[PDB]
Design a protein around this motif. Structure first.
Motif, PDB file in Angstrom:
ATOM      1  N   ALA A   1       0.825  -1.202   0.000  1.00 62.01           N
ATOM      2  CA  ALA A   1       0.000   0.000   0.000  1.00 62.01           C
ATOM      3  C   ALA A   1       0.862   1.256   0.000  1.00 62.01           C
ATOM      4  CB  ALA A   1      -0.936  -0.006   1.206  1.00 62.01           C
ATOM      5  N   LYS A   2       1.906   1.280   0.831  1.00 57.69           N
ATOM      6  CA  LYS A   2       2.762   2.457   0.908  1.00 57.69           C
ATOM      7  C   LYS A   2       3.608   2.618  -0.345  1.00 57.69           C
ATOM      8  CE  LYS A   2       4.186   5.158   3.574  1.00 57.69           C
ATOM      9  NZ  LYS A   2       4.804   4.899   4.903  1.00 57.69           N
ATOM     10  N   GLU A   3       4.006   1.512  -0.977  1.00 51.90           N
ATOM     11  CA  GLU A   3       4.776   1.627  -2.207  1.00 51.90           C
ATOM     12  C   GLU A   3       3.910   2.037  -3.391  1.00 51.90           C
ATOM     13  OE1 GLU A   3       7.668   2.007  -2.741  1.00 51.90           O
ATOM     14  OE2 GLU A   3       7.790   1.834  -4.924  1.00 51.90           O
ATOM     15  N   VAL A   4       2.597   1.826  -3.323  1.00 53.26           N
ATOM     16  CA  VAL A   4       1.722   2.394  -4.346  1.00 53.26           C
ATOM     17  C   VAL A   4       1.442   3.861  -4.051  1.00 53.26           C
ATOM     18  CG1 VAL A   4      -0.562   2.316  -5.365  1.00 53.26           C
ATOM     19  CG2 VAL A   4       0.703   0.203  -4.998  1.00 53.26           C
ATOM     20  N   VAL A   5       1.147   4.178  -2.794  1.00 59.36           N
ATOM     21  CA  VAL A   5       0.937   5.547  -2.337  1.00 59.36           C
ATOM     22  C   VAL A   5       2.003   5.829  -1.288  1.00 59.36           C
ATOM     23  CG1 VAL A   5      -0.710   7.228  -1.452  1.00 59.36           C
ATOM     24  CG2 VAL A   5      -1.522   5.232  -2.733  1.00 59.36           C
ATOM     25  N   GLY A   6       3.014   6.606  -1.663  1.00 63.49           N
ATOM     26  CA  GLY A   6       4.132   6.874  -0.780  1.00 63.49           C
ATOM     27  C   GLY A   6       5.451   6.919  -1.521  1.00 63.49           C
ATOM     28  N   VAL A   7       5.521   6.239  -2.661  1.00 63.20           N
ATOM     29  CA  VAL A   7       6.690   6.289  -3.531  1.00 63.20           C
ATOM     30  C   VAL A   7       6.490   7.413  -4.537  1.00 63.20           C
ATOM     31  CG1 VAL A   7       5.862   4.721  -5.318  1.00 63.20           C
ATOM     32  CG2 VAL A   7       8.306   4.890  -4.843  1.00 63.20           C
ATOM     33  N   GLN A   8       7.506   8.259  -4.690  1.00 60.76           N
ATOM     34  CA  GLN A   8       7.409   9.390  -5.604  1.00 60.76           C
ATOM     35  C   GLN A   8       7.987   9.074  -6.980  1.00 60.76           C
ATOM     36  OE1 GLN A   8       6.206  12.871  -6.993  1.00 60.76           O
ATOM     37  NE2 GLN A   8       5.874  12.367  -4.836  1.00 60.76           N
ATOM     38  N   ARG A   9       9.078   8.311  -7.043  1.00 58.70           N
ATOM     39  CA  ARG A   9       9.689   7.912  -8.305  1.00 58.70           C
ATOM     40  C   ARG A   9       9.495   6.418  -8.522  1.00 58.70           C
ATOM     41  NH1 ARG A   9      10.583  13.098  -6.298  1.00 58.70           N
ATOM     42  NH2 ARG A   9      11.688  14.315  -7.881  1.00 58.70           N
ATOM     43  N   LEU A  10       9.269   6.037  -9.776  1.00 57.58           N
ATOM     44  CA  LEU A  10       9.124   4.646 -10.177  1.00 57.58           C
ATOM     45  C   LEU A  10      10.150   4.327 -11.254  1.00 57.58           C
ATOM     46  CD1 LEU A  10       6.278   5.024  -8.746  1.00 57.58           C
ATOM     47  CD2 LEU A  10       5.474   3.290 -10.349  1.00 57.58           C
ATOM     48  N   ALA A  11      10.711   3.124 -11.196  1.00 55.62           N
ATOM     49  CA  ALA A  11      11.728   2.702 -12.166  1.00 55.62           C
ATOM     50  C   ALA A  11      12.865   3.728 -12.129  1.00 55.62           C
ATOM     51  CB  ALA A  11      11.085   2.512 -13.526  1.00 55.62           C
TER      52      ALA A  11
ATOM     53  N   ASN B   1       4.805   9.220 -10.300  1.00 54.92           N
ATOM     54  CA  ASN B   1       3.894   8.198  -9.788  1.00 54.92           C
ATOM     55  C   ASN B   1       2.480   8.748  -9.904  1.00 54.92           C
ATOM     56  OD1 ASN B   1       3.022   5.780  -8.696  1.00 54.92           O
ATOM     57  ND2 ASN B   1       3.403   6.399  -6.571  1.00 54.92           N
ATOM     58  N   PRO B   2       1.698   8.282 -10.882  1.00 54.61           N
ATOM     59  CA  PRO B   2       0.347   8.839 -11.053  1.00 54.61           C
ATOM     60  C   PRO B   2      -0.560   8.602  -9.860  1.00 54.61           C
ATOM     61  CG  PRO B   2       0.627   6.877 -12.401  1.00 54.61           C
ATOM     62  CD  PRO B   2       1.977   7.209 -11.852  1.00 54.61           C
ATOM     63  N   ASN B   3      -0.238   7.638  -8.997  1.00 55.98           N
ATOM     64  CA  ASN B   3      -1.053   7.311  -7.833  1.00 55.98           C
ATOM     65  C   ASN B   3      -0.348   7.660  -6.526  1.00 55.98           C
ATOM     66  OD1 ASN B   3      -1.525   4.465  -9.813  1.00 55.98           O
ATOM     67  ND2 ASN B   3      -3.083   6.067  -9.601  1.00 55.98           N
ATOM     68  N   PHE B   4       0.450   8.724  -6.526  1.00 52.05           N
ATOM     69  CA  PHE B   4       1.160   9.165  -5.331  1.00 52.05           C
ATOM     70  C   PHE B   4       0.292  10.164  -4.576  1.00 52.05           C
ATOM     71  CE2 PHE B   4       3.577  12.667  -3.485  1.00 52.05           C
ATOM     72  CZ  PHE B   4       4.310  12.013  -2.514  1.00 52.05           C
ATOM     73  N   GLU B   5      -0.015   9.848  -3.321  1.00 49.07           N
ATOM     74  CA  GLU B   5      -0.859  10.661  -2.453  1.00 49.07           C
ATOM     75  C   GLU B   5      -2.276  10.809  -2.988  1.00 49.07           C
ATOM     76  OE1 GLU B   5       0.887  12.370   0.766  1.00 49.07           O
ATOM     77  OE2 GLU B   5       1.227  10.306   0.094  1.00 49.07           O
ATOM     78  N   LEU B   6      -2.667   9.985  -3.961  1.00 51.04           N
ATOM     79  CA  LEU B   6      -4.038  10.023  -4.457  1.00 51.04           C
ATOM     80  C   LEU B   6      -5.021   9.588  -3.376  1.00 51.04           C
ATOM     81  CD1 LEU B   6      -5.901  10.482  -6.921  1.00 51.04           C
ATOM     82  CD2 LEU B   6      -5.527   8.080  -7.507  1.00 51.04           C
ATOM     83  N   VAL B   7      -4.653   8.576  -2.594  1.00 48.63           N
ATOM     84  CA  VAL B   7      -5.468   8.071  -1.497  1.00 48.63           C
ATOM     85  C   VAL B   7      -4.573   7.926  -0.276  1.00 48.63           C
ATOM     86  CG1 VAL B   7      -6.550   5.982  -0.593  1.00 48.63           C
ATOM     87  CG2 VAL B   7      -7.308   6.933  -2.779  1.00 48.63           C
ATOM     88  N   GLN B   8      -5.043   8.411   0.869  1.00 42.14           N
ATOM     89  CA  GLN B   8      -4.296   8.247   2.108  1.00 42.14           C
ATOM     90  C   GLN B   8      -4.617   6.895   2.731  1.00 42.14           C
ATOM     91  OE1 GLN B   8      -5.444   8.291   5.520  1.00 42.14           O
ATOM     92  NE2 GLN B   8      -7.527   8.191   4.806  1.00 42.14           N
TER      93      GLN B   8
END
Lengths: 50, 51
Positions: free
Chosen positions: A20-30, A35-42
């Motif tokens: 969950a945190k790596e989907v929402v909480g990670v700012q850079r990918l690869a 990250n289009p889903n960064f901070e989208l949902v808490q």
């Protein structure tokens, strides 16, 4: 008539907190992809379920 | 010449610690959340004597 839904909460067990945190909480990918889903949902993590 | 002392070690609690047997960290995908933070999550997931 469609309904307006604005999901803003993500409830997961402690075993899925990492994902969950790596989907929402990670700012850079690869090697840099934003990250289009960064901070989208808490996210809140709970131990009562599962 | 001599030294003297009164002491001994203790066990604090059985469910507040963990030790694993692997540490590789190759590309931070072998153990990132596979065996290094797997134990972190295991500690996160525990129950007292009341369910």
């Amino acid at each position: 008539r469609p309904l307006d839904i604005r999901p803003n909460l993500l409830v997961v067990p402690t075993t899925l907190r990492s994902k969950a945190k790596e989907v929402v909480g990670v700012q850079r990918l690869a090697n840099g992809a934003d990250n289009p889903n960064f901070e989208l949902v808490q996210v809140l993590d709970t131990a009562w379920l599962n | 010449f001599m030294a003297d002392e009164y002491r001994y070690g203790v066990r604090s609690r059985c469910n507040v610690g963990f030790g694993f047997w692997q540490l590789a960290a190759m590309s931070t995908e072998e153990l990132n959340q596979v065996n290094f933070e797997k134990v972190y999550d295991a500690m996160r997931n525990q129950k007292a004597d009341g369910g």
